[PDB]
Amino acid sequence: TCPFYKKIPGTGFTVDAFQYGVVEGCTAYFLTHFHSDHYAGLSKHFTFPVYCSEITGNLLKNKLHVQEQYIHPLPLDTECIVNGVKVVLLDANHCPGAVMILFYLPNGTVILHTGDFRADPSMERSLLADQKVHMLYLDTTYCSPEYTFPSQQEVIRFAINTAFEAVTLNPHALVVCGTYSIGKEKVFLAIADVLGSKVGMSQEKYKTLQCLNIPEINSLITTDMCSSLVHLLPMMQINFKGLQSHLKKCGGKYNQILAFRPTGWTHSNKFTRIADVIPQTKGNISIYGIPYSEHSSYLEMKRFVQWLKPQKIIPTVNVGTWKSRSTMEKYFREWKLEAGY
């Protein structure tokens, strides 16, 4: 049944709750972003109001064929009324179109639902600065101190410098980047920019990108693989067998592959700096795992929460085991005692 952490008290609202059938007493279904674990259940057959960003609403219409009359896009950073309740959508610094939602309850309670987010000090100057938030529904993906990772900017610098050096040393090398969802577009776009290439991809993935309101996108991507030396493939194909296979398909235009897998966290983070990352190599194929995250590190999460000073935290991630739930609750209490709220 729908878990309590997807329901907003004092309203008829749910968040990211599309896979439970008709949720009893739900008048409006919010969707924070277009990732499958969150939209699971939506289709052209859905006939309740979906509230979301503009970009999310483009993907719902074009990719899932949801009917236009049930898509209610809202502008960001704008006080809006939904079924008699004031709400605001804020940028979540996750994937394109991802939002956090502020709910102003009739009784005076203020609730923030982060959806999925990568906390940033820039959030401390949004409309969140303007009033007190009583309850926080928190993306706790990486809520443990072992989870460190570099800035997105440091990771993109490493990727651009590695790609540029490789292709300048061997003008017959092909670059390949993995993907399985929207998000992390900077990785393949930054690499294509330094190389003076468009990124080549499947018609399905091209259609997905054309929904994202990214400026000048027609100048950066293409479905003509032959004209491109940065290719995007399913993340599943980013292995020596899949890459050898792909190389055959390019008809001797290329004699080497340099591939990137933009992972979340992986344990070499606990030891190794970005400067010191090395690839796995077999013959003329090299694969780099790069820690490009669109979720908060432990320290980023901690800073946001100690800034906001909520009265109550409701985790939305890692809630399935008692050991995770108890570990998370211990961190929340530490943060509260350290900061004095």
Q: How many Cα atoms are found within 13 Å in the side-chain-facing hemisphere of 274?
A: 20
Alpha-carbon distance of 277 to 22, in angstroms, equals: 48
Part of the chain binding Ni ion (CB under 5 A), chosen from 41-49, 109-117, 200-208, 230-238: 109-117
Q: List the beta bridge partners of residue 51.
A: 30, 72
Contact map string, positions 248 to 287, toward Ni ion, x by CB under 5 A: ----------------------------------------
Q: How far is the CB of 31 from Ni ion (least distance, A)?
A: 11
Q: How far is the CB of 33 from Ni ion (least distance, A)?
A: 6
Q: How far is the CB of 280 from Ni ion (least distance, A)?
A: 27
92 vs 229, beta carbon nearer Ni ion: 92
Residue 139 makes contact with Ni ion by CB under 5 A = no
Q: Count of residues binding Ni ion (CB under 5 A)? A: 2
182 vs 191, beta carbon nearer Ni ion: 182
Alpha-carbon distance of 255 to 248, in angstroms, equals: 10
State the alpha helices, DSSP H only, in 170-317. 185-195, 203-210, 240-249, 298-308
DSSP state of 236: G
Q: How far is the CB of 28 from Ni ion (least distance, A)?
A: 21
116 vs 300, beta carbon nearer Ni ion: 116
Q: Which of 30, 74, 116, 159 binds Ni ion (CB under 5 A)?
A: 116
Part of the chain binding Ni ion (CB under 5 A), chosen from 110-118, 154-162, 185-193, 203-211: 110-118
Alpha-carbon distance of 298 to 59, in angstroms, equals: 31
Part of the chain binding Ni ion (CB under 5 A), chosen from 34-42, 66-74, 145-153, 214-222: 34-42
Six-digit token string for 112: 């923030």
Q: How many helices (H) and strands (E) does the chain have?
A: 8, 18
Q: How far is the CB of 297 from Ni ion (least distance, A)?
A: 16
Residue 35 makes contact with Ni ion by CB under 5 A = yes
Q: How far is the CB of 292 from Ni ion (least distance, A)?
A: 14
Alpha-carbon distance of 52 to 97, in angstroms, equals: 8
Nearest to residue 188, comparing CAs of 169, 203, 207, 209?
209
Main-chain phi, psi angles of 321, to 5 degrees:
-125, 145
152-169 vs 185-195: helix crossing angle, rounded to 10: 40
Residue 16 makes contact with Ni ion by CB under 5 A = no
48 vs 180, beta carbon nearer Ni ion: 180
Residue 230, H or E segment: strand 230-234
116 vs 185, beta carbon nearer Ni ion: 116
What letter represents residue 319's amino acid? V
72, 48 contact by CB (below 8 A): no
Part of the chain binding Ni ion (CB under 5 A), chosen from 32-40, 130-138, 148-156, 204-212: 32-40
Q: How far is the CB of 170 from Ni ion (least distance, A)?
A: 36
Residues that bind Ni ion (CB under 5 A): 35, 116
